[PDB]
Each structure stands twice: as C-alpha cells, then as structure tokens.
Amino acid sequence: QNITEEFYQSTCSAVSKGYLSALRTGWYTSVITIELSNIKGTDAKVKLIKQELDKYKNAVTELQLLMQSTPATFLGFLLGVGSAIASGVAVCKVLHLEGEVNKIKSALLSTNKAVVSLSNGVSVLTFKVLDLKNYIDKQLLPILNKQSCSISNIETVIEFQQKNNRLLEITREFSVNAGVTTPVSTYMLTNSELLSLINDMPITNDQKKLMSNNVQIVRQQSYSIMCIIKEEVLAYVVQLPLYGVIDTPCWKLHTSPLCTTNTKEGSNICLTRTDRGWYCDNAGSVSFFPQAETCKVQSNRVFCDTMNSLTLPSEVNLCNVDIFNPKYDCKIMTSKTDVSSSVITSLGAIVSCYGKTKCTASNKNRGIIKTFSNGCDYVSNKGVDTVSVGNTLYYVNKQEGKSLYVKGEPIINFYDPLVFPSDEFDASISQVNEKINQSLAFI
Amino acid sequence: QNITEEFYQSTCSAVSKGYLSALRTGWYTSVITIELSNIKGTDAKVKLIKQELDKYKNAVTELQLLMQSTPATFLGFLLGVGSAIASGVAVCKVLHLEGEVNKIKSALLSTNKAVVSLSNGVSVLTFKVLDLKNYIDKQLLPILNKQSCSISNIETVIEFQQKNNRLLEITREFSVNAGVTTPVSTYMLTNSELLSLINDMPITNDQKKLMSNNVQIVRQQSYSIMCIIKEEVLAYVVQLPLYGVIDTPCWKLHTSPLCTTNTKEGSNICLTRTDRGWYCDNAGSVSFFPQAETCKVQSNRVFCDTMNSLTLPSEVNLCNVDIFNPKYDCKIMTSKTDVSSSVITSLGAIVSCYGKTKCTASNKNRGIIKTFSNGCDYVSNKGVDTVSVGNTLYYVNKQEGKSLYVKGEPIINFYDPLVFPSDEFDASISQVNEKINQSLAFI
Amino acid sequence: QNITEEFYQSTCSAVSKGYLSALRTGWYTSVITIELSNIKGTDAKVKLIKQELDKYKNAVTELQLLMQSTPATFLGFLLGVGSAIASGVAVCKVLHLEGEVNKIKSALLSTNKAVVSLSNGVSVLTFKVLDLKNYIDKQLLPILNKQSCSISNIETVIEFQQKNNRLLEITREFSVNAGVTTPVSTYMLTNSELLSLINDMPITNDQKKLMSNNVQIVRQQSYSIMCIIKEEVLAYVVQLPLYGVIDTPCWKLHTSPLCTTNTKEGSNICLTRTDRGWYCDNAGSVSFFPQAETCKVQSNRVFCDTMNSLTLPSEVNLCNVDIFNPKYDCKIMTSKTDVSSSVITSLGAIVSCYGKTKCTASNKNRGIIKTFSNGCDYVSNKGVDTVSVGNTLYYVNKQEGKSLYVKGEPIINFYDPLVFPSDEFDASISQVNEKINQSLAFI
Ligand SMILES: CS(=O)(=O)CCCn1c(Cn2c(=O)n(C3CC3)c3ccncc32)nc2cc(Br)ccc21
C-alpha cells in the first residue's frame, strides 16, 4: 500500500502509516505424530543398518527421558505477564489421560490427517507426518530376522538413514530446548505439512491466505511442545497463532530526545515522548506495542502479538497532532542528558543533534548534502542514503513513500529550566505541569 | 508436590509455593577430546572418500584458525556482573602449557574415560568421545596408498561420512558461536556420553540423580568451550553446573499495579511491588531471582543460577503477609499510570483493571463467568481457562493446586493523592513515607 | 598486549585498559549465488534420486514462497535506533529491477568470482558458490530421460545428496529466520568462501588481515539476506562489517554501588556510576558502548558496533580520575538500596558488601584469604580464583595483567543523608548538587 510518514518538529517524533494489521490474538493446538516401531554374524551393510537402528532406539529413549517432567517455558515495563504455552501444555496434559492416545492412534489408522475431539471437549487437528513403524516392521525387520542377519542392499541403508534422520533432528531440537521449540522448524513440520495443516484448519479463507502467504512468520509465532511417547506413538503439540485481527490500520511511532540548545553545558533540559512503538486499531480501542521489535513487518503488513500490547483509548493518537490535547495525557520522560543520536524511521531519519556533535545526511554519490544544526530535525529517505551522528553511520530505509515535515515550535522551549522537573521517566504532560506548579508555589 | 498459591488483595500480588530448589552454585570442568589423524587416477567411490577427507581437513584447519585468540563470552538492575566461563577458560589456558595435552593423550590411551590432574592442581574428568585417528589410519589410509587410489567399497564411503559428520557439526557450532556454545548440544556430548559423564562425576548420588533426570536442563546450563588442537588431539572444555543447593523451599512472587479507581482520569495513583521473581531458601538467607525468566521449572523443581540472584535477609518474605512490617523495608514503585493488564500466575491470574477496560475470566465451554470491576483482583485456574484484559487474551496455567484468596484493603487507599510521590521506581514503603512526611512538612 | 587495571576506591569503579579497537563503522554488501536447474518404472537407486530431486524442487518452491514480501528485521536507553539491514535490503531491491539479475548471471558465466556494478551505481562483489544447474543438467538429467528411468549407480545417489544438502540447509535457515540470518553460517558462506571473499574485498591489508584472523567474529557481525530467485539464479545478499576504526585505545569501565555503611538499616545512601561499558578512542571523540555485552573481546582486541554507541567528548574519561572534575558532568544514579553484589572485572573483582552479607575472596587450594568489610572494595586476580558475595560464587578472570589499587575516600561520605536525593536514575554530579542546593534552600 501507500506507506506515508509525518515528522513533528514540535515533539521530535514521527508517525509512519499505511500499514495493515495481523495480530495474534489466540492459539490453535494441533497434535503432530510419528508412528514408532517396537523392535528388539554381520556384514558391512547390516552393520550400518544396526548402527542406524541404534540411533533410532537412542532417540526414542532420549525423548522418553526428556518427558519425565511437565513441559515449560520505553514502556515495556507496563506490560502484563502471560503464559505462552499454557494452552498447548493443557492439551498435552489431556493426551496423558488413559485411552486418549489410543483415540488418536485409531483416528490416523487409514489416513494421515484427522480431527479428534479430546475427552475434555477440545477438538484438535491431528497429523501423522512419519510412519517409522511401517518402515521398520517392513523392509528392515525381515532382514534382521529371516537371514540373520543379512539379506541387504546399500539402497536400504541409504533409505533408512533418510527416513530416520527426521526423528534424529527433531530429537536434537528438543534436547537443546528442553522439549519446547520456537520458531517451529521444517523438521517439526515441513512447508507442505504446515501448508496443508493451515488449509485443514478451522479458520476463515482470509486467515488461510494470510498464513499461507506468510508461513515464515507463522513459524516464528508458533511453538512445538514435546508431549508424549506411548503405545508406539510419538506426539508433539504444535501451537499455532490465531490472527483474530486482520487489515486494521497500523502506524509506527518513532521518538527521539528534544533538548534546548543553549551554549553553556549542562544548562539544557530535555524531553522525550515515551509512547514510541507500534499502534494498531483494534476493536474500538488501540493496541499499543511498546517493544516495536516484537512486531514483524512484511511489506505493508505488520505481525504483532497482543500479549505484548497495552489496550489504550484511541485518543492516544492525539499526542501526535497535539501533545497538549485535553483528552489524553501524553506520556513523556524528562532529563538533562543532551546526547546526540538518530532514529531511523520507515521513510526517513530523525536527528537529535546536541553539543559539539557532527550531524549530517548524505547521498551515495554526492556525499554530504545537509548539515544539521543543534536541535531535533528530520530528513526523508528521498535522495538520502545515510545519516551520520558523531561516529555512528546510519543507513536509511530505502522503501518508497512520501514524507511530510510538519513544522512547529519545539515544545521544550515552553518550559522554564529553573523549575523543570528532570529525571522523570514514567511521566506525562500533566504530571510535569503538576510538579512545575508545586515548584512555582514554593517560590 | 503440592503447589499452592495465595493472592493478597491488599497489595495486588500472589505467592506460589511448594517448589523445590535446584540452584547452580558452582561449575565443573571436563575436557572432551576427539583423536585426530595426521595424514597427507580416481574412481567414483574414492572420489567421494577424498571429498569427505577434504571436509575433515578443512574442519581441522577451521578450528585451528578459530583458536588464534583466547575464548570469550523489575530489580534486575541490582544484580552484580559475573564471568560465566572464567573457570572453563582458566582450565583451557592450562591445557596450552607444554606437556599438558600430552598427559591427557597418554591418559586416554587404553580407555575413553579418565580423571587427570592438571599441572595447576585442577583435577579434570577427561573423555575421548571419538577416535578419528584410528579410523582414518586404518580403513582409509590403506586404500589411498596401497592400490593408489582404489580398493574401495560403498559401505566405507557411508561409514566415513557418518563418523566424520560429528566433527563437521561440532565445527559448524563453534564457527557461528565464536568457539563458545550454550546449550551444550548432543554433537558436543551425546545423551549417553553426558549421562556417563554425570555418573563418573565427583558428586553426591542426589546430584547424579537430579542431573540424570534433568539432562535437558543440565545442557541449558552448560557451556562448550573450544580449547585446543595439538598433537592430533582436539579438545574442548565442557563446563557443567554444580547444584550445591537442592530441595530447599522455593516460591514465586507475582505482582501487578495497584491503583485507585476514581472516575476523573489522571487523578489516580498507583503502586506496584517490585520484588517479584523467584525466591529460594538458601543457607540461612533467601536467594532472590528478579528475572524469573532466568529460572526453569520442571514440575515442582525449579532450576536457577545464583549468578542472577541477590542474597537477601529471610525477612524479605514478610512483605507478602505484612507489607508495612518493621523488619524489612518492602520495595515498591509508584506512578499515576493506571493501565490495565493481567499477570498469569502458577495457579490463577491477577487482574489489574482500570479505566474503561473490559476485563473478564472465561471457561472453555461456558464463556464469560466473571467480569472484573476496576481495581486489582484475582481468579484461580479452577474452572477458568482464559482471562481477557482489553484486547489481550491470556490462557491460564492448568496445573492442579489450591489457591487462597486473602482479602484485605488495597493499601493504595491509605495514601493522600495530593502528597503521593509518583514516578518513584527504586522505592520502598519507608522511602515513600519519608517523602510524604517532607511534603506534609512544607505544607 | 599489556592489559592493566585500576580500581578507584573513591567511586567503587575500575578501568581496564590496553585493549585495541575494531569497530564496525560501515557495511559491505556482496551477492552470493547458487545456479539452479529448470527441470521437469523405477528401481531403488532412481527412486532415491527422484526423492532427492523432490527435496530440491521443494526447496526452490519454499524459497520462492518465502520472498513474496520485502526482507525485514545502565545507559542503553540513551542509544539511537538504526536499521541494521537497510543497505543490504536496498541492494536486494535493485536486484529485482529488470535485467539486473541477468547482468550477474552473465558476469559469473566463466568464473565464480566477479565484481558487478549495479544499475544504481553500487559496485557489488558477486560469488557463485554452487552450480546445481550444471550438476543436474549433466549426470542426473541423462538418467531420468534416456533410459527411463534407470541407468544409475549408488555413487551418483550419494553425490547428489551431498551437493543438494547445502541448498536444503540454506533453505532451512531462511525458513526459521524469515529470510534474514545472523550470524552467517558456513552453509551461507564456507570458511574458504568467506576468506577468499575477504581477500577480494575492496579494503586495506590491515582490514583483510583483521577479518581473516577473526572470521568467527566477522560471521557474528554479518547478515545473510534471502533476496531473489529468478532466471535459474538463487541469490542472497551477505552484508559484511566494515571496520573503519582499528587499533585505537579501548578501555572497559566497571562500576558497582557505593553506599554508606551505618548500622541502622535503611539509613544508608548509595550512589553508582552509570557510565559503565566499553570506551574506544575514535576520531577525536570517544565511542561509548553502554551495553558492554554488545562488544566481543578477542585477546586484547575488542570488536564493537558503532550503532550501539554514543559519541562523547573525550573529557568523559576524566570521571575515572576525578569524578568532580569541572569539564565533564559525570553520570551517577542514587538510591537507598544497599544490597550486596560483586562485579568481575578484566583483572580482578569489585565487591560491594553491605548489611549482614558474607563477602570473601578465595584461592583454589588455600580457601578464604580475604574477608571483606562493609563498603566497596576490590581484589586483583593474582592469587585469587573466586569471590563470594552472599550465596553467589564468582570465578574471576585468570588473564595475566597488573592491577593498581587507587586509594581514596568513598565520595558517598561527602553527602548529608538528610538532603540526599535518592531514586535518581539518569542523574549526574551537578544534578545531584543542584537538588541538594534546593533542599538546603527550603531548610
Ligand atoms: C536495565 S536499566 O536500564 O538499568 C533499568 C532502569 C530502571 N529504572 C527506572 C525506570 N527507567 C527505565 O526502565 N529506563 C530505561 C530502560 C528503559 C530509564 C531511563 C532513565 N530514567 C529512568 C528509567 N528508574 C530507576 C531508578 C533507580 Br535509583 C534504579 C533503576 C531505575
């Protein structure tokens, strides 16, 4: 779509818009299974088969030993605390109840894909992705018993190594992740397996299309939870994201310190909007993601997780156009630390240049085209390739889109430095006003 | 065991207890070795062997190039700063002293497991996990020399690929981890290798049992440090956790913001207990782990690292029953930021619901069964599957255990908002009282 | 070199010096390519080949599906915000322009290494690391067509698995990293490939030597960005670090809380220098890296990234010798939280011991050799192996180098606790003085 951006000189911040939401709001749990074999002079070929067979037995033993316990795993400090795999773990707990695994084993007898309702009413999609039981009970078992121990060909050795390797790698992953992995690898679930899983999922076509067109994101937002080995069934729960909010407007708020620029060192005061992060319209409110690194952007689609959000009044948006607006108390932090830096935005760069710092913007071939004066300023990515603040070189994002420079008096100029409350972190416009009023009162 | 939980309405916090400790207090260093070979018309089979031989030589060269340098690698801000592999690195430094590697090579001549005392008095367990010297000097060397270059069979090609692969993977791991890996993979140390290493370790039976029953945790708390290649010996130090504290009571403290709930926006004041995290009885004091994510829970056993702890007076526990107790100055932060969230506990959910936020608790099949009013409240996981605060859905942990709701007046009601010191982060009950006394004095 | 260290008793801090810089200041983008094949009764050998061929087709399809979108990915809070792969992504965008891939394909027709200037003037080094087109169009295609479907030998099966495996692993990596990986693995770029890439790079001999002697660090500071599949060319951009600052002095500042040690609990005040981290002389200024974990140390060489730095006046160094110096306003935080901890330095250990905490330093064989009294103190690593503060055991670094203990009155003694501004985080000597002056004024 049309990604656009606005820089507000008055508050040293910038909003990038035109993004479309894809928010993980829920979890879907599928049960992925591997059917196992329960099995007991040597030539070179049979020796290899027995070595591979040992790797198979060891992997099973290792996974069994692994499940002796229950499976487990600016404004960010305001977030709540969730339990990411509580739902997957609950489904896994149900799989341990007597008869439960047997239901699944029976379901997948004549097909590899099936929906099974568990005893607690939970309806899970089930998937047998590998039948090692059939392979070992055929092909291999006849050669290790009938002509003890050899009627063997090299192609069988190769084939067994190929088939067993998936089990070995899944086991490797679980072994260094304490039975819980994320992102979900293609060993857990191949691309085709995941795609057909998504297709057979109880979701809308919009969700199926969204997930199929972004499987690499789906993998990053999924968990594989090692669950149970019982009755020749190896089962792990794959916990998949449900995107219950799709195609709502999203915008990214970038902020940077705004300081006075007086000559005398240490006489300057600063203010920074702390409400930077991703914002998405969501159900009459606004979902706010303070750790913008928790969201992943694909073109103009932004994938976030509501577990890492606050739910805010939509008036929080007013802080962008009018930070002194009466409907929402815009959040800021204050300080006297006027250090220089830059924030690279979607479509340009914010530059907070203070003191003796050299701040410039350059083009690839031309070199320096703008030298920043002290204060907070901005340049768009059109005709600009890099920005330098001090010894730090920044490459700007080269995505196409228009920027708008909104001129306005830096609001830091509205404050008397003699009564300015610095070192306020979790503050706001009203809180700062409140403290200023008290300092003025005592004077 | 019996996991139980208590919610304190007065302070918007909850303690989960019944856990048993397993604290890493020390480090054990073992030396793991791979014995290497020092070696110099083609048919298809020999061509493959030579290709595999090149992968072997390259891996050795790569690891040699790698060791041109020395190996290196709310209240969390209060923690000290350690050097995690200082002990392993020190042992590795000793291995570089002349004659030192030769001692090990000699020790493992007729066995794969041996204890060796180093020249500095350190007694290390040593383990030859792979003898590539013997394999290459036999089997392979006779075919690349005698009938230059071919008396070869396909099973030898396969076998060499299998044996060499471990070396290639170990090399891969070290290459993207700058010679220091964690968790320790099954390439570094297979499950059987680790289990027998643990068995031969100079530790108590309780420790051996604990480590053997939790090898996946042991791996996560271990380091593999690439150390030396000298005299056909490849050696890496595996640094294993020593659990010097086992089976002491542990409890997890969950906290959430407690705010007044007045109608007028921005007129509310908040307070949050900052001492959330894991607590374990330890040697007459209490080990406090502020970053509860640094601990791993397996059923009712909790694995932590003392490097990520403070050592506190046991009176810190009093803050749970009486936050105004005279024996310990309970830590809190203050603010006016009354945003809504939930904290998912071991056995329920704390809900901090403020403003216009929709806060509910639901069952799987029934739907909404409780709607929270403004304030801090709690619900147990019995009959509850999810909690929703705003647009954020939380699944609760479904583990069995009893919760106790301890009623009490929210302590935030005891404060006059006109003299309440907000934006205090590293604060406490007494510090807040102290500041209130000064504001009252000037009035 | 000579690593030395000084401990300042007056401020509970220590500086380690003698380090040499290697700062990533820029980015170089190379284009790595894999040439692909565009291809359409069974015996065991051909069945395996067709299975491997399917893995090849699936990998291609998977990577194609992957690129349906644009590629994306105390005092730390003061840092700016960059876009790490903006330059690589920009080059990738250029590769999508018509004719652009064809230029590269033509360039690498008769050689595997070539420099190509793109249409936007960017000169990129290009590298064909694998020719699957040639392998499949030869060897394989003649057997799947001519004697449909079998004139096959087992060595061809093996060889194809070996050659195809790299493609499968690269695909695996991109699949769980959303097309952007770091560190750059040996699948993306083998050690030999990287070394010759570095050799053919447009950089000085000093840089080539530095990068070649530290390829494992180079990998950690590099990105592999999956870019395009078009006209039988698979291309990913590898974004390599440019070290524009080499061999300037670096030093590491360690700090720890300095508190009064009065008997009455809660009557103590504390101060901590917040400017801890790595410092490097750089272009007439000092590059300051607050998150010292963002730098990697190899012997006496320290690798940092300027994106994680502030650019400071060189007078910031004065805070080490004279924290009350008039030329730079040294940064500190204040509190009343007198908890005990230790900071392990390059050549010793800082111990902040308060309250009832047991604080000691030990040798390997002798045991406790020093018991710390309350206050901030230090011990060198000479003759010391461990330090214990409370229940936390610390191993000290055993690297060789001399320490100097600089005696001086703890500056916390210069403050009157009755007017001491605690809970100041982003503070400084002057700011604290300023607040003290106001509290004294109102009294
Ligand atoms: C890891 S850390 O940065 O050190 C956590 C520091 C938390 N902390 C706070 C709250 N706070 C933050 O969270 N950040 C930035 C990390 C986002 C701040 C920046 C500027 N002012 C206060 C900030 N106030 C404190 C007062 C005292 Br005394 C000791 C710690 C304090």
mmCIF file of N, CA and C and ligand atoms in Angstrom, chain A residues 74 77 333 423 425, chain B residues 74 77 425-426, chain C residues 74-75 77 333-335 423-426, ligand 1:
data_model
loop_
_atom_site.group_PDB
_atom_site.id
_atom_site.type_symbol
_atom_site.label_atom_id
_atom_site.label_comp_id
_atom_site.label_asym_id
_atom_site.label_seq_id
_atom_site.Cartn_x
_atom_site.Cartn_y
_atom_site.Cartn_z
ATOM 1 N N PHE A 74 10.272 2.066 25.383
ATOM 2 C CA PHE A 74 10.467 2.600 26.738
ATOM 3 C C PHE A 74 9.491 1.993 27.741
ATOM 4 N N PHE A 77 7.886 -2.068 30.484
ATOM 5 C CA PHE A 77 7.691 -2.412 31.895
ATOM 6 C C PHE A 77 6.211 -2.335 32.310
ATOM 7 N N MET A 333 9.237 11.484 29.037
ATOM 8 C CA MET A 333 10.245 11.429 30.077
ATOM 9 C C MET A 333 11.058 12.718 29.984
ATOM 10 N N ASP A 423 14.777 14.068 35.170
ATOM 11 C CA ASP A 423 14.850 12.709 35.703
ATOM 12 C C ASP A 423 13.471 12.150 36.068
ATOM 13 N N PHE A 425 10.852 9.603 34.540
ATOM 14 C CA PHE A 425 10.797 8.606 33.484
ATOM 15 C C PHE A 425 9.381 8.226 33.066
ATOM 16 N N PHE B 74 11.673 -6.571 37.701
ATOM 17 C CA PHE B 74 11.915 -5.126 37.820
ATOM 18 C C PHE B 74 13.320 -4.819 38.329
ATOM 19 N N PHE B 77 18.417 -4.755 37.546
ATOM 20 C CA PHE B 77 19.497 -3.766 37.532
ATOM 21 C C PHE B 77 20.324 -3.793 38.829
ATOM 22 N N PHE B 425 10.810 4.740 41.210
ATOM 23 C CA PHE B 425 10.996 3.382 40.727
ATOM 24 C C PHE B 425 11.685 2.460 41.728
ATOM 25 N N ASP B 426 12.859 2.866 42.191
ATOM 26 C CA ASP B 426 13.623 2.068 43.137
ATOM 27 C C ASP B 426 13.262 2.491 44.558
ATOM 28 N N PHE C 74 23.774 0.422 31.961
ATOM 29 C CA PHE C 74 22.686 1.237 32.520
ATOM 30 C C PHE C 74 22.103 2.200 31.491
ATOM 31 N N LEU C 75 22.958 2.716 30.614
ATOM 32 C CA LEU C 75 22.607 3.866 29.782
ATOM 33 C C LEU C 75 22.218 3.505 28.346
ATOM 34 N N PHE C 77 19.357 2.992 27.198
ATOM 35 C CA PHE C 77 18.151 3.726 26.806
ATOM 36 C C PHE C 77 18.484 5.047 26.091
ATOM 37 N N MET C 333 23.777 7.313 39.419
ATOM 38 C CA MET C 333 22.427 7.112 39.907
ATOM 39 C C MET C 333 22.502 7.053 41.430
ATOM 40 N N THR C 334 21.415 7.413 42.099
ATOM 41 C CA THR C 334 21.380 7.402 43.553
ATOM 42 C C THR C 334 20.266 6.500 44.054
ATOM 43 N N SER C 335 20.443 5.938 45.241
ATOM 44 C CA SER C 335 19.400 5.122 45.844
ATOM 45 C C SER C 335 19.665 4.913 47.324
ATOM 46 N N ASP C 423 16.812 7.718 44.547
ATOM 47 C CA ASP C 423 15.946 7.340 43.433
ATOM 48 C C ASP C 423 16.098 8.278 42.230
ATOM 49 N N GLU C 424 17.322 8.743 41.999
ATOM 50 C CA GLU C 424 17.666 9.464 40.775
ATOM 51 C C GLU C 424 18.412 8.513 39.847
ATOM 52 N N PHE C 425 17.856 8.219 38.682
ATOM 53 C CA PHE C 425 18.497 7.254 37.805
ATOM 54 C C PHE C 425 19.381 7.885 36.735
ATOM 55 N N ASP C 426 18.807 8.788 35.954
ATOM 56 C CA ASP C 426 19.538 9.450 34.885
ATOM 57 C C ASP C 426 20.145 10.744 35.417
HETATM 58 C C1 LIG D 1 18.355 -2.166 32.878
HETATM 59 S S1 LIG D 1 18.124 -0.497 33.480
HETATM 60 O O1 LIG D 1 18.142 0.474 32.414
HETATM 61 O O2 LIG D 1 19.232 -0.069 34.300
HETATM 62 C C2 LIG D 1 16.590 -0.421 34.396
HETATM 63 C C3 LIG D 1 16.343 1.029 34.867
HETATM 64 C C4 LIG D 1 15.049 1.034 35.692
HETATM 65 N N1 LIG D 1 14.910 2.229 36.499
HETATM 66 C C5 LIG D 1 13.972 3.224 36.297
HETATM 67 C C6 LIG D 1 12.946 3.231 35.163
HETATM 68 N N2 LIG D 1 13.687 3.504 33.963
HETATM 69 C C7 LIG D 1 13.848 2.607 32.844
HETATM 70 O O3 LIG D 1 13.367 1.486 32.773
HETATM 71 N N3 LIG D 1 14.665 3.279 31.855
HETATM 72 C C8 LIG D 1 15.094 2.788 30.569
HETATM 73 C C9 LIG D 1 15.495 1.322 30.487
HETATM 74 C C10 LIG D 1 14.198 1.797 29.841
HETATM 75 C C11 LIG D 1 15.010 4.588 32.380
HETATM 76 C C12 LIG D 1 15.819 5.714 31.804
HETATM 77 C C13 LIG D 1 16.009 6.999 32.602
HETATM 78 N N4 LIG D 1 15.388 7.135 33.939
HETATM 79 C C14 LIG D 1 14.594 6.022 34.496
HETATM 80 C C15 LIG D 1 14.408 4.726 33.680
HETATM 81 N N5 LIG D 1 14.132 4.182 37.264
HETATM 82 C C16 LIG D 1 15.157 3.793 38.073
HETATM 83 C C17 LIG D 1 15.798 4.453 39.336
HETATM 84 C C18 LIG D 1 16.939 3.765 40.024
HETATM 85 BR BR1 LIG D 1 17.724 4.579 41.562
HETATM 86 C C19 LIG D 1 17.457 2.469 39.520
HETATM 87 C C20 LIG D 1 16.830 1.841 38.309
HETATM 88 C C21 LIG D 1 15.645 2.576 37.593
#
